[PDB]
Scaffold this active site. Sequence first.
Site, PDB file in Angstrom:
ATOM      1  CE1 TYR A 229      -8.334  30.430  19.083  1.00  0.00           C
ATOM      2  CE2 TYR A 229      -9.789  31.078  17.268  1.00  0.00           C
ATOM      3  CZ  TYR A 229      -8.637  31.283  18.025  1.00  0.00           C
ATOM      4  OH  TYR A 229      -7.772  32.314  17.706  1.00  0.00           O
TER       5      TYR A 229
ATOM      6  CG  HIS B 234       0.630   7.464   4.297  1.00  0.00           C
ATOM      7  ND1 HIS B 234      -0.373   8.400   4.139  1.00  0.00           N
ATOM      8  CD2 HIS B 234       1.352   7.870   5.371  1.00  0.00           C
ATOM      9  CE1 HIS B 234      -0.262   9.326   5.081  1.00  0.00           C
ATOM     10  NE2 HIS B 234       0.774   9.026   5.833  1.00  0.00           N
TER      11      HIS B 234
ATOM     12  CG  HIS C 219      -0.283   0.395   2.486  1.00  0.00           C
ATOM     13  ND1 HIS C 219       0.390  -0.512   3.276  1.00  0.00           N
ATOM     14  CD2 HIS C 219      -0.209   1.580   3.135  1.00  0.00           C
ATOM     15  CE1 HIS C 219       0.843   0.091   4.360  1.00  0.00           C
ATOM     16  NE2 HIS C 219       0.496   1.365   4.298  1.00  0.00           N
TER      17      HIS C 219
END
Lengths: 128, 129
Positions: B124, B61, B59
Amino acid sequence: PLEMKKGRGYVYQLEYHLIWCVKYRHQVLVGEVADGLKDILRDIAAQNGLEVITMEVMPDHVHLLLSATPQQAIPDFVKALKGASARRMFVAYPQLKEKLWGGNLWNPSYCILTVSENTRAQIQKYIE
Amino acid sequence: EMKKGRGYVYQLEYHLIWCVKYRHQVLVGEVADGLKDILRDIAAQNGLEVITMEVMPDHVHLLLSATPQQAIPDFVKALKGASARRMFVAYPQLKEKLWGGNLWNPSYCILTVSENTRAQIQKYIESQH
DNA sequence: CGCACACTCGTGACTTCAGTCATGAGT
DNA sequence: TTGAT
DNA sequence: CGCACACTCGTGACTTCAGTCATGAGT
DNA sequence: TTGAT
Ligand SMILES: [Mg+2]
Ligand SMILES: [Mg+2]
Ligand SMILES: [Mg+2]
Ligand SMILES: [Mg+2]
């Protein structure tokens, strides 16, 4: 474990902090006008398949925290959120034309930031 | 920190992951090295910034940074579809285990990324002063 | 001040058919 | 009709 | 046997003109 | 041709 939504050909978790202002920075989003805008923005959001995690309306600007799918493109939903809300707000609150008679309720720009739903730790776990 | 375009200011990052079809551990040695050059090249062509890139045997990423106008399905298509075409041409031996015309799993995983969590960001937002 | 995201003019795309998104340029 | 989230 | 993101077939769009993206259904 | 980042 990472919070993750599943779709047909993708697994995802997409959140954005979206912000925009009233044209000329006029402080018109108050009282019933701010209340209405909340209804209008939620309706547009649902119509577009967007989840509104947070919404806060200040007199001259709006702050949204959204959750979306990979198919919802940014220029598309911002257009929906702002364009349609401007149209409706002017209809529902003709008094806005007093300070904004130029044909715009909003500043022509938007600010947008991607947002991590999970912690850096959760991510490294999943990614390792 | 914050980038700007003609009608927007933004900071957009995404973790993008996808796997090799059938989960075959095929991305190794020179195959992995070539994959990296192909991805970097495709990213360059499409004006995508690749912050981080990792290639495991099964895989990939990536940590990307993009503009508001670069939609997810489009850049994922570019990176996966173009790399697949290119990988088979450059490394035909891939066909020994993947003769069905697919180098990649048909799914992708994608996560928005920021320098803080939404939990903190929403608090926030609820403040004002 | 002189921009610029924010002001203004202009272009096209497309919904909300108005007023945003896309977008270049002048101030 | 602007002056920053 | 059933799932599904991950397997397969099906439906289209669009570059890489192959093999991904979009996508519904079976297993 | 699959079994999980
Ligand atoms: Mg705009
Ligand atoms: Mg796919
Ligand atoms: Mg300029
Ligand atoms: Mg299914």
